[PDB]
Design a protein around this nucleic acid. Sequence first.
DNA 1: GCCTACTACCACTGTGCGGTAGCCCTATCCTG
DNA 2: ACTACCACTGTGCGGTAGCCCTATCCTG
DNA 3: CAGGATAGGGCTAC
DNA 4: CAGGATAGGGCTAC
DNA 5: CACAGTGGTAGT
DNA 6: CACAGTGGTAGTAGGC
Lengths: 548, 549, 343, 342
Amino acid sequence: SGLQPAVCLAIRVNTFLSCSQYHKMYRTVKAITGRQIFQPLHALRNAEKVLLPGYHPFEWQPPLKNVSSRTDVGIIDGLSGLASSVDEYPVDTIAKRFRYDSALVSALMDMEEDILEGMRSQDLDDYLNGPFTVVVKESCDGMGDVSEKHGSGPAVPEKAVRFSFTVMRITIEHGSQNVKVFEEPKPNSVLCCKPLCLMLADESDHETLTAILSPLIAEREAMKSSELTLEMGGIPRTFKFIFRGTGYDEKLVREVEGLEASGSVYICTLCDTTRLEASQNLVFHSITRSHAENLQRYEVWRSNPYHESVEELRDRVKGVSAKPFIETVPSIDALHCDIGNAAEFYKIFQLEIGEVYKHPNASKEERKRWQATLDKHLRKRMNLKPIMMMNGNFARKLMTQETVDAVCELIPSEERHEALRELMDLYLKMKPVWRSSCPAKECPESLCQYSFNSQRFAELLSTKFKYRYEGKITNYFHKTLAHVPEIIERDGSIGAWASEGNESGNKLFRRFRKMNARQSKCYEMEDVLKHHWLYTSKYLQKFMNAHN
Amino acid sequence: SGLQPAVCLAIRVNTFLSCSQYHKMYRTVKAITGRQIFQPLHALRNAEKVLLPGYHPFEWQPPLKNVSSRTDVGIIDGLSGLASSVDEYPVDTIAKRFRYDSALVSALMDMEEDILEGMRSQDLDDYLNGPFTVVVKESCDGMGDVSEKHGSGPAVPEKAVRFSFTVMRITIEHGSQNVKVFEEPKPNSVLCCKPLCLMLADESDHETLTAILSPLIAEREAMKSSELTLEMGGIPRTFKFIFRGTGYDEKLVREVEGLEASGSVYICTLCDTTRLEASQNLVFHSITRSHAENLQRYEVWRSNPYHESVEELRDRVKGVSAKPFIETVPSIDALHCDIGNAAEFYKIFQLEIGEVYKHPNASKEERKRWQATLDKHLRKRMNLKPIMMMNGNFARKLMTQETVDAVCELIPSEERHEALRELMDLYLKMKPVWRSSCPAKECPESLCQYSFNSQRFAELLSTKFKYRYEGKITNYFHKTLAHVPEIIERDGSIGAWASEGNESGNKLFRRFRKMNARQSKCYEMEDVLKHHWLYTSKYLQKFMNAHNA
Amino acid sequence: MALQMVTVGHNIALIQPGFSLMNFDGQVFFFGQKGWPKRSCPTGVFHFDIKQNHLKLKPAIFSKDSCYLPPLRYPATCSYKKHQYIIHGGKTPNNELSDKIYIMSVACKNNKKVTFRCTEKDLVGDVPEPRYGHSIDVVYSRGKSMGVLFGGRSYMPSTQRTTEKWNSVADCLPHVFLIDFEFGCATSYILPELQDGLSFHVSIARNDTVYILGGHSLASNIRPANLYRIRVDLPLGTPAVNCTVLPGGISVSSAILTQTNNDEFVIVGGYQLENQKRMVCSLVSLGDNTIEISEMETPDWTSDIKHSKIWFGSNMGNGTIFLGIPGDNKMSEAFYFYTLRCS
Amino acid sequence: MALQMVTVGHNIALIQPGFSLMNFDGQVFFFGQKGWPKRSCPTGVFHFDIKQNHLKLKPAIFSKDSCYLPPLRYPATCSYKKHQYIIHGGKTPNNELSDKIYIMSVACKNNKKVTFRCTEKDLVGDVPEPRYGHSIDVVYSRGKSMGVLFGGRSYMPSTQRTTEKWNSVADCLPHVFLIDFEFGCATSYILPELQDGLSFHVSIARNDTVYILGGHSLASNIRPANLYRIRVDLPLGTPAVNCTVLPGGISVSSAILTQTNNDEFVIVGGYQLENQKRMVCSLVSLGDNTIEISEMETPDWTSDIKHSKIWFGSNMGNGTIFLGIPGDNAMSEAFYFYTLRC
DNA sequence: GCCTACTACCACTGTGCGGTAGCCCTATCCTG
DNA sequence: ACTACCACTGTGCGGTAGCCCTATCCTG
DNA sequence: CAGGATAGGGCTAC
DNA sequence: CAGGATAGGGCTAC
DNA sequence: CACAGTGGTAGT
DNA sequence: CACAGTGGTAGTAGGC
Ligand SMILES: [Mg+2]
Ligand SMILES: [Mg+2]
Ligand SMILES: [Mg+2]
Ligand SMILES: [Mg+2]
Ligand SMILES: [Zn+2]
Ligand SMILES: [Zn+2]
């Protein structure tokens, strides 16, 4: 009684309740109270239909090229007709995806109430059919350690790829200005990164990745050139779509944007700069790169219309030896920028402990000893344990002034102490900017002073840390220093557009694969995708914020 | 028309709902329905107080030696006063434990309902204060991959130790019969392996392990010498306790029973036999190894009264060079027996793919190619993914005549096909015995013919697998073949007495550390122990089984 | 015949199914690497140097005027004559099909480090379509060499291609495209004998005839035991191409074809059907207008192979067959490799 | 003085805090190994062999007449004159405390296979309660000899030991048990100067006397800077014992004591506080009836050391100190080790 | 006075990321 | 609305690729 | 120059 | 005997 | 013969 | 500047 199936489903998914555990609870309640407080599993499963893609009727004007107009399409095989024939490429991957059309439609209709609330909050007629520009944060991340299951099905890798999408900013054109009828308040929330494709593949396996995603990219390109008429709130509203591919880590960006690996002399996914030039200039780089430029550049690399060597050709294309697969935005993964910059600060601490500014060469095991010193101390003072690979929470408890104080305790030279403290002061005057979901509203003068603090960071890097940044520089330092202001004035934020959300979604993918999915290869991805779509349903989340 | 706090707690726990998730659900149901259907968190904690140790007044009419008579202690520090002074041995360990007497009292008063129900089912007045012998399966296990947490606290290892106990059977002595008023139907269930000590240590770290458990072991030894007057159903019932430490992986058994590691010439935690003698006789071995005998043997080792060389001394004490600190039962971990036996059959399949019965001198790489052949085939036929370390599920899918039929497709000798199929037929006529919770009920004909099937299995290892079994034999093959009949005559079951419960509870330890515990070294073990106790509370499992009753 | 497990530890991960070996004066060359060309070998073409039955992929380089072609997997590879390899179609690692032709000549040989000229050839006239699993093989009619391109798999036409079936392949309209290379032109021929689209069919051009063997037709999902013989007569004017469905054809797909002797090829491996791979190597002895598909002595197929659901490879070129089988655990051991030297 | 970072191999895991080194042979032997003696070294005793700053723990063996004593942590280790080593107490790896005394002699040296007659001396009389952190030390008065066992943590008595504080240790009643190894007879002595039970103290045994030095009183949790001098006289009667708290003591605990030169010792490391370990070494020069605790030059402690909360060690016997510090803890290496020679 | 309900606070989580220990027997390799 | 079936899960359990540049090594 | 360590692999358990 | 591979480590991202 | 799920689907 | 928890106090709002 008094509990609708949609509310019961919200309770189930948002509480991470499995259908099995929810059934336990529902039958226990039905037996103890007698009343059927919670709705049965079948009622939840029927409510899901409303929230899952393939329920709401929509159309695209113009109709999407190469995309089924069939609105009955929910979860489909991400393989997308990919022949598992022995004669064909041995696709070893369980891929289940929503059709990007249907996914956007369900994500909007799920925010139907939110969109109406925001266009009412923006002093507009909530019956406006005007074209809503829906800025969508495309997000893809490989997971790894995704233990494959016994049973029928391919010999999938113990790796996953989660192409998600966060509807970040719905703005309608109310005459002259683009009034923002909705902004994802927590853009990097796992509650908002709508899953779109879960494939049990490796992002480093470009062939499989592409076979699985090129349907999604084709839908994405179709939607870019189209307008989604969708019956929201009884009115047919038109939604233009701006897909900003930003939740891709630099490794994946390079994979999909045709670029060489991050170790490549060509250091950015944004500028055509060499790691050396980036260590020399360090702050003054425009955003040169783009999916279109990278496509032209792979076409150049392939056709070699200037009959150049591989080296000078590579320079002509600036590392684009592969064909850009995805139209990612030349942006920064704030999450992985924090990760990489904190790992570089961590190595910097290792070195300062080694006085490498005084001792250019040093034993590899002596460097391990410095790392162990830093580990023991960070555990002593900053209480944060040693981790194999840098994570964000470590990068946050480490990119801290008390952390650099603790490290300084390990350095005898107070000159290096001040070098490090200044480096961190600048990095933390800068980090709000590329972590803020809206630095103009969370760190305005930390952004206005970003060019200056980045110039000073670069000075300190090429002067006080030149033992580490002579002819070399981390790609994420280059991004942090050179491109952040451009990305702010372009996108408005960087943290909002991070892979953070899709990585939290990796957490929930693990949780759902272990606790909210049929533990069979044939159905793990379908069920995880269903449940992770429901988890991200702003509708169910509304029901779960009913206490407010 | 709301729910009671105890039943809402049962829901929160058995549905694995965190208190945060439960609060979301509760506030959502309260704001949607407008009425308080679920009881808020504070009510759930007030209920937990009842189900957690340190609530029900109890009294050991022989006062427990070295145990506080205080019936209020719940989640105490497992360190048990272990001096974390910098001068002392570094306690790189977070241990939270229940006092074993308090824990047993809470476990009983939790199955109070079940005890009385079974006394009634036996047509026994549910007011009989007769001495209930509570046969408890105290189960310890180590679990690695326990991600250490940032934050203040000792630099604990990424390894845990769950000392659990499972009330296996409560039998009241009704004068002329030891009728069992309770018997854990699913003894290896995670709903019954009650957490007693969550240590954030390694079981291989004997120093810390002992510092943390010897209090539990002292409580256990005291309760072995005392009757527990506990007021249930309004009557002061008295419970005698038979502790049976069977839920120990042989590694841990040997660690805590003073024995050399599994790899050893001395092969069984049960008999004082050598791997050679065990590959020669292979069945006729009597259970000799007791905690008392192992103590006497460590005292002989330490004392070396007969002034014997280390070799003859070690063959006098039969591998007991360390001192036992846990009184485990001479028993077989059916879980790890199935796992080790399936690993050995996996190796057998490898070697038959390699025809090592013909070419016993392979080179480390055709062996890998045979392992890979087996991997590919079991994945193709048995749908078994290649796992790094044999798990029980891979084992029970691999120990099937289907798996042998598949593997034989890799052996170009129908003679070896027949050998493997006979071996597995025997192993599957034997496994029900040391896996069943009551073979005399689940597989009596297999137990009757277990001696014969094991003799046949042993002569099949001696004849057609002379390789891999000439002068060598796995410890768990020796246990399966030699001791199982005696362990059944002694304990009525082996699988009931397995670590499968405490292991399966490792899954819940992980789940609760991630999702039902404060993510702080100072609180993770306390919270996991609390919630994993509640999970194992039959009082709550009843509410979750009210759909039936 | 002579099977020997090959070893490779570095660059092994690049050997994917669909890879295409090219024999250049005995020097075997890998192509169709897994993924896009890494800076180790930005070309994707490697020296396929098997020494002591250990395979080394040595990064090869290209000419200056070369077109750094994509790693094409399952393309149509032939030898035009110069001795340049024609490469049509194939799956770009983006699972795009290449309408381009890539004539990989050898421009310079030094250190035995060969430089290639992977000249892009565009197809004027009747560009076949972006396809893969097809065949290209040069016929020689009246001294005019002309590639015969017979269909393979292609993605559904962009009109019928849907993203829910994006990677859905259809065997191309069974046509015989006469790829002229001195004219860069292609000419399709609708042969009534070829009305069941084929792909992954071994193709053997001797002088002027192309024996299309085996194959797989998705319109049927069968591997028809067909032996189409596409005889090409090239008058100076419009060409002529006549197919004749000869008997004795074998039902094989994805098979590998190596020329052991002149006019004596070996169709080893492939697939008789999905879960049954053709573990019987076949001999194909040809003549001016005849062909005999014998059944060679089935090699001592390793258990790894006999039980390998999937198995791929390519003709090293002399008489040998590089043959890979998935041996993955999930890991630079995904594909256990073998060399089958025939005669 | 000479701090030399030491590498250990294949047995680093056995070197645990509370380990004891015994200098027979001039070659040092490691006794208290982590966990119970593995069949690699069923005896627990090891050939402690520092060679080129590398530590090779070569499994030693015991005689036939020997007692395979447990790996005792923080026992009372003394050399005794044969050149035996007394080992009283210590935490048996089961966290039990040994009451037995273990007299490790040496026999049958094969140039590689030194063997020990680890006799088990049992005590009759005022036997010292099972304890650890104490300090047995041999005095030679009137040509006779006795072992001055003093202090040490012990588990609460079974009359008062509760399983909730099972491992809670009380500093043993401050008593100087004269232990006659000549007969294995322990004679306890109540000395008013020793009001606080000490543990993890240094004990420097010159002739006729034992300088107790800088322990840790647990009742107070304080490390008193006391320098109790237990002057032991053996005039063939009731063995007299007069303690004397001397001015000059140092607040240390768990400190390592080496005898660099005769009548001269070095107190290395230990702890001044749980907050701060002791980085200053202390030269303790002894005259037949006096003691002077100088302050050596603080060795150039590696930042590994300076910033390690915990640090343990033992006198190898050549004036050098084998001291370990917790290393990078998953299984990188439990401890880093150093041979600080003097 | 209570008792119940809500909420902040704490200080961190995981998602970012891909076989050990022992015994013991044998092959190495000192070894004066 | 229950409930089974399904074929499986986790508990058993402790860094990777790529780029590049340099140091080796390996030539004819 | 056969005996006494060492390394390493097979094997036992995890 | 300097040039052209190879191995391996540092470094970039995961 | 571990067992408590894992979610949908079919079947009562 | 990720964020949604993680649970148990502590404290603060209401009811009497
Ligand atoms: Mg990732
Ligand atoms: Mg990634
Ligand atoms: Mg264990
Ligand atoms: Mg374990
Ligand atoms: Zn850039
Ligand atoms: Zn036995």
